[model samples]
Target: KMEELFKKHKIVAVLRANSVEEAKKKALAVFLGGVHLIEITFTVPDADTVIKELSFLKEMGAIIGAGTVTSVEQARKAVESGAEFIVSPHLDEEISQFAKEKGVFYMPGVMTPTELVKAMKLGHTILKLFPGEVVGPQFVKAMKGPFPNVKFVPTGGVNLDNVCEWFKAGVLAVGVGSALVKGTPVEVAEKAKAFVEKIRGC
Candidate 1:
């Protein structure tokens, strides 16, 4: 289950590459550097193809998911293409329903308490804090007082310096993109290693 995956990895490499090869390269780089969870958003070209190519990594401990998924069709294609989980930028009843029907893990973006309650009613516990820069760690810390069981995976605005702050504030995992994936494959591997080492220190 993703709950166990999140508990073990604590970091997800959110990739929005321009090409399929680029996505594969970065995914392998991140895995080599000790990050097992990877999220390839639909913005990338041929994202499904990329997922299919990399799905084999599951045997070696790579956990892949689809992101920026706004429609049920995209979610269906992603899952059929071998994606293990589905994530959306916002909460959608249809997409959530589809994920449940397929028995796939779904994590929807939520920024308000009302949205959180709505998602909770749908049996969702792990949620994403979209545009994390806007809400900041204080939001998670504040919400934890009342919603202690809700796990958050903050995406966007998270960098090497502030990752621990999110975890300290009571997050289950952090979703990071450009901050951790850049430069050459070797460089990207090095960057991922830095993040893994830092988060492990926590």
Candidate 2:
């Protein structure tokens, strides 16, 4: 079910806001612009409140995930606050372990094949291929040859220009942070349309 939502909505609006209210407005703007999945990073002040507040969005079938989780405590707090999934910036087995025992999905960031295998060994299937700008779509393609059963959601550096290339390379989804919310709601909406519509036919 989670994978279905992910593949169907390839764009995840990664947001870091000043306040819970700003987070709400930014996420809602993206939600209105055809991307409903939002990841509220732990860097935001009162990030738990933002996740808790956004739980109501689940009514619209929007998936809310917590980003930057590196510890078990952060994982516990995020789940308690209504995050449906946990996204870590690195391969933290403790975060993945607890989240697994608690019944929540985990996507740990990994840049190397060793880390990728480590995350999979810890029971996470779909992983976050970090720093997509540096890795590029080609990176995703190359990884698929060895980890064919594994699916990746590329985070970092996903923008309007080459999002399609990533899709063509078989990425399950993309976690767009800076690129997704680069401007005001209206401006970001345009960017969202270009990215979202560009992949719809695929």
Candidate 3:
């Protein structure tokens, strides 16, 4: 249920802000532009509240999720507050266990062979490839060879300029931060629409 929306959108707006109002505004802008998934990070103040507010848009086909989640307690809070999915920057056993038990989509970050192995061993096939630009999208091609079953959502350094590159590289999805919501709602909406057009164009 969850993965379908992520795949449909082709990009997850990794929204971060100091205040909940700012996050909500950007979320509305993204929605206005016709992309409905919003990932509000825990780094922001009152993030749970923001998630709850965004949940009101669920009737409009919005899918709200939480990012930068590191602990089981945080995961629980996010889920209780109306997050349909949860994402983490690093993989934790307790987190994986907790998310699986809750029955929501869990995407934990993995980079190298060891961490990737651990994440797979933990039974999480869908993974987040953080700092993706460090090794570049080619890394997705490299990982798929050994673990043909695994699918990666390359996060960092993804933007409008190179979004197609990641899509063309055959990533399951791309996690786009800074690029999607760095400006006011007006500016963000424009970028959001352009991004939407780009994904559909490909």
Candidate 4:
């Protein structure tokens, strides 16, 4: 269901903030960078409000979602706030089930073959290969050997230098954070455009 979104936008910015204002600022920055998929981790205070506020961006055709959700309650609240998908730091049956019940796409994090298999059995098609640096691209290439049907969205440690390598390694997409816009003026749109072009080459 999120295939169209995945193809249209190659990068998903996972934002972590301490307050709603900060979250909005960071989101606006990534938005200016040309990112359409935004995932506000639950670590942010009043995250639901962030989602609520950004959901309306759909009028502009933005694809927004909530991240780091670990419970069904969080998932339900995200859906209520107009989240198009649910992202978790790890796999949780309840959260995954809830997303499916609400018809929202669920992308749960997984680190090992065992966890990946378990999540797939639960009907989750897109999994987050988190701590991508720890597992590295070699892990993904190895997994593809036997589990080619398992698609991935590798997050963490992803930067401009290695993003193309991840894509060439067969990742369906990638999740990038501060590295993409760190130290740059958040109000600038050129940064986002540059990121889009960089990922496009991959």
Candidate 5:
């Protein structure tokens, strides 16, 4: 079920808002803009609380996941609070262990083939490509040459303009942050709408 939603949407709004209230508002705005997948980063204040608050949107076809989870406790709390998936900037076996126990999907960041192989050994087929702008689409394209079986979703520095390039480079999905969620709620919705249409059109 989650896989279907992810494959259909292909866009995860990496929410990193200033306040708890702002996170909720931005989440709703993105949903209104036709985005279904959201990665609520732990950077926000009381991120678990925000996740619990937004869990109700599941009925409305929203897929909420937790991101930037560094500690195993945070991962456990996120899952307990209703996060359907767990994401981290770096790979940690303990966190992965917790996710496995809870049966929640986990995606860890990887910048090199060594880390990618390590993640694969840990039973992660899909991974996050962090600081994507530095490597750019060509990097994914190059990585695909050696790691054809692994799927990557580039996070950080993914924006409206170059999203197509990432897809063209064979990324499974794109995690967009501040670039996609800017200005007021209404403006954010508009930007999201454009992003959704652009991706769908592609």
Candidate 6:
């Protein structure tokens, strides 16, 4: 899924929708900003439609996936709709196993060392450290000393200002939302482009 893109960009923009049209416009805004990796959360209505449309755009070389998935059924459906990867707010063995069986990248969320260890034992190498603000960069730095083999994407509370701090702390990537899109009109592509540039350089 994002194996290649992650190696390249290391930043994935997450788009949560209040409506399908809003999702499409916001996604395009970010895409226009040179962001190649994107995630459309299931919290969006008709997520399948959003996924399908993004999948078509992917042919032009974008890396996209689904987020906020909590069940195997949703994971299966997301995979079927051309989601290259799956992200959830919590670790779900059922979803993780299904993703592995289908050969899709799965990034289940974990907030504690125990939870992270458990997920790693299940064959997950890439994990999402959700609510990263709560855990903070110190956690990432500390975790790396003992579990250097594990790679993490720190989501929640990630923004242009603190992205560099996360990267310096040993995170493989960061998931950014609102701060990247908030207040910027959907039609204003430059604002989003600047935001993308800010994070990319960070």
C-alpha lDDT score of every prediction, in listed order = 0.91, 0.81, 0.85, 0.80, 0.87, 0.81
Query: What's the lDDT for residue 112 in model 1?
Result: 92
Q: Lowest-scoring 10 consecutive residues by lDDT in candidate 3?
A: 2-11
Q: What is candidate 3's lDDT per residue for 104-158, written digit by digit as tens?
A: 7899999887999999899988889998879688888887789988888988888
Query: RMSD per prediction, one decimal?
Result: 0.9, 1.4, 1.1, 1.7, 1.1, 1.7
Q: In candidate 4, what are the lDDT values of residues 1-202, reduced to their tens digit?
A: 6866886788887775567876777777777677887887877886788989877677776678888898888887888877888899899988887777878898899999999989978987678998897998998899998888887899888887888888888887788766754543444346666777788975
Best by TM-score: 1
User: In candidate 2, what are the lDDT values of residues 13-96, reduced to their tens digit?
Assistant: 678666788777777777767787788888787778898988888898678889888778888889999998888889987787
- Assess candidate 3 and give its lDDT: 0.85
Model 3 residue 116 lDDT?
A: 91
Tens digits of lDDT, candidate 6, 1-202 = 4565686787787775578778877777777777778888888897768888767668776778898988777887788888889999999988988888888888899999999999989998788999898998988999998999888899888876788888888777788776655544564356557766666675
Kindly list the per-residue Cα lDDT of model 1 for residues 1-202, writing each as its tens digit. Answer: 7888798888998896779988898899999999889988999998889999898999999999999999988998999999989999999999999999999999999999999989999999999999799999999999998899898999999988899989899887889988887677898889999999889895
Candidates ranked, most accurate by lDDT first: 1, 5, 3, 2, 6, 4
How far is 94's C-alpha from truth in model 6 (Å)?
Answer: 0.8
Candidate 6: segments with Cα more than 4 A from true spot: 184-188
Q: Residues 85-148, candidate 5, lDDT per residue (tens digit)?
A: 9999999999998888889999899888889999999998888998797778887898888888
Residue 137 of candidate 6: its Cα lDDT? 90
Q: Which ten residues in a row have the lowest lDDT in candidate 2?
A: 193-202
Model 6 Cα shift for residue 166 (angstroms): 0.7
The 10 consecutive residues of candidate 6 with the worst lDDT sum are 180-189
Which candidate achieves the best lDDT against the true structure? 1
Error of 3 at 150 (Å): 1.0
TM-score of each: 0.97, 0.94, 0.96, 0.93, 0.96, 0.93
**Model 3, which residues run further than 4 Å from truth?**
none
- Give the lDDT of residue 130 in candidate 2: 92
Let me know the TM-score candidate 1 reaches against the reference structure: 0.97
Residue-pair clash count for candidate 4: 1
